[PDB]
Amino acid sequence: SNATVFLSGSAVEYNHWETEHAEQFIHQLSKELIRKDFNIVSGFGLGVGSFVINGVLEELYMNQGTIDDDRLILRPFPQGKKGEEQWDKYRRDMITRTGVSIFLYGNKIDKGQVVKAKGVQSEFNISFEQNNYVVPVGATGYIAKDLWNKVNEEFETYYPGADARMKKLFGELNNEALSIEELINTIIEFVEILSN
Amino acid sequence: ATVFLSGSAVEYNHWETEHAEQFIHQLSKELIRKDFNIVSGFGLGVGSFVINGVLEELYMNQGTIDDDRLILRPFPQGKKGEEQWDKYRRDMITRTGVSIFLYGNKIDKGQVVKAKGVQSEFNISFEQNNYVVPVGATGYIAKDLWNKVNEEFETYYPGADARMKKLFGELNNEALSIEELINTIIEFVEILSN
Ligand SMILES: Nc1ncnc2c1ncn2[C@@H]1O[C@@H]2COP(=O)(O)OP(=O)(O)OC[C@H]3O[C@@H](O[C@H]2[C@H]1O)[C@H](O)[C@@H]3O
Numbered sequence: 609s610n611a612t613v614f615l616s617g618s619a620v621e622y623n624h625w626e627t628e629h630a631e632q633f634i635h636q637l638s639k640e641l642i643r644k645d646f647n648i649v650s651g652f653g654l655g656v657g658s659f660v661i662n663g664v665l666e667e668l669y670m671n672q673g674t675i676d677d678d679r680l681i682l683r684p685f686p687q688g689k690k691g692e693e694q695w696d697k698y699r700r701d702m703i704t705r706t707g708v709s710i711f712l713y714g715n716k717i718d719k720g721q722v723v724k725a726k727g728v729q730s731e732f733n734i735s736f737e738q739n740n741y742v743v744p745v746g747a748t749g750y751i752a753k754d755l756w757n758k759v760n761e762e763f764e765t766y767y768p769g770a771d772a773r774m775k776k777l778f779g780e781l782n783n784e785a786l787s788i789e790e791l792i793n794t795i796i797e798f799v800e801i802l803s804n
Numbered sequence: 805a806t807v808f809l810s811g812s813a814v815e816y817n818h819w820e821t822e823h824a825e826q827f828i829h830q831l832s833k834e835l836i837r838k839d840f841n842i843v844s845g846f847g848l849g850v851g852s853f854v855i856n857g858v859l860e861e862l863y864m865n866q867g868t869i870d871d872d873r874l875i876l877r878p879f880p881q882g883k884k885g886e887e888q889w890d891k892y893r894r895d896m897i898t899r900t901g902v903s904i905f906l907y908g909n910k911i912d913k914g915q916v917v918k919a920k921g922v923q924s925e926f927n928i929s930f931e932q933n934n935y936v937v938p939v940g941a942t943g944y945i946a947k948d949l950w951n952k953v954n955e956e957f958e959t960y961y962p963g964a965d966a967r968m969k970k971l972f973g974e975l976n977n978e979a980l981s982i983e984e985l986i987n988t989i990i991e992f993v994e995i996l997s998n
């Protein structure tokens with residue numbers, strides 16, 4: 609049954625979408641996950657985490673709810689050298705309660721240049737190591753695209769025994785022509801199948 | 805007992821940056837050791853060190869972040885997030901019974917200014933009938949709040965005894981070492997927590 613997902617991602621740019629449009633996508637994806645009775649773990653990634661929070665708080669507070677209901681589990685990363693020493697252990701810890709991991713975007717500024725986000729790759733590896741189903745949203749580009757290609761290349765390793773609907777939905781995760789609503793509905797239906 | 809840890813900083817009064825970070829780290833670690841839980845809003849200059857101190861204790865004692873000894877509520881940044889900040893603060897402080905205030909400064913209009921968000925969290929704490937622990941020795945908003953409470957002491961700590969009054973005074977003693985200031989804070993919280 610629908611349980612807890614890890615929502616992985618970071619961004620300073622959003623492939624073919626303007627920032628405000630990608631923010632709406634992340635906000636509405638997070639809201640729809642809540643409305644479908646999922647819980648979310650988020651590491652508050654730059655360019656992503658704030659909009660996850662925004663979508664969840666909209667749904668909670670329209671219902672006089674509370675962040676203490678643990679629909680959204682927040683694990684912001686400690687910044688600086690001491691913090692970085694714990695990031696691997698912290699990731700392995702925070703992913704434990706999740707069973708499905710979703711990957712979005714994955715890019716950051718390093719030395720004044722936009723580069724791929726290795727932390728999203730690390731979260732993919734950790735997720736797979738505990739036998740989570742992984743959901744790389746290739747249409748969002750960057751690491752998520754690399755991960756989508758990796759999974760596509762060894763599909764039966766990641767989704768053994770998948771049915772035709774799963775295969776179609778997986779392909780649509782990489783369809784850059786889909787609207788926000790169409791891409792969200794693809795992700796949600798795929799994650800529901802993987803949770804059931 | 806669950807405490808709200810309020811604070812933000814881009815500078816740290818008289819202290820060397822790493823020493824102030826270590827103070828925040830060690831305060832958080834010793835709160836965990838003395839069996840408190842912490843709610844943190846992940847304030848700039850503060851939140852990372854709260855996390856560092858808690859993780860150090862948890863991960864040397866076979867612990868997990870899921871035991872909710874440290875409850876994290878990072879703030880959504882941007883215009884939409886700002887619209888929810890007051891409701892988010894009132895929400896996250898609800899489960900706490902005591903609030904601690906550290907530092908409280910930020911950049912505004914190119915300048916280091918006192919952090920109004922820490923003042924807002926003080927007012928919410930008071931409105932929810934939390935006890936307040938303003939660590940005046942850390943300067944900035946926390947010192948303003950220490951002075952305010954000191955001037956209206958019986959409003960905030962009715963019926964306090966000599967020991968409580970001594971500890972409250974020591975919260976503003978800038979001569980104390982890191983460990984002495986931490987011990988003052990936690991012994992005061994222990995009184996306020998029953
Ligand atoms: N001032 C900051 N304040 C708060 N948070 C920050 C800041 N600056 C960076 N962050 C975030 O720290 C994490 C560790 O950094 P990182 O591993 O180098 O980042 P990444 O490679 O982009 O990985 C992305 C994945 O890690 C996590 O968020 C990353 C960064 O977004 C999420 O779980 C992502 O899914």
Ligand SMILES: Nc1ncnc2c1ncn2[C@@H]1O[C@@H]2COP(=O)(O)OP(=O)(O)OC[C@H]3O[C@@H](O[C@H]2[C@H]1O)[C@H](O)[C@@H]3O
Nearest residue numbers: 810811812845846847848879881909910919920921922
């Ligand atoms: N890029 C950022 N990433 C993450 N977090 C950030 C960033 N930039 C700012 N923050 C934090 O947002 C909160 C709202 O901001 P604010 O109200 O303007 O801040 P403040 O006046 O300094 O209040 C301080 C109190 O608020 C909360 O953290 C503040 C800021 O530190 C805590 O609970 C404090 O105890």
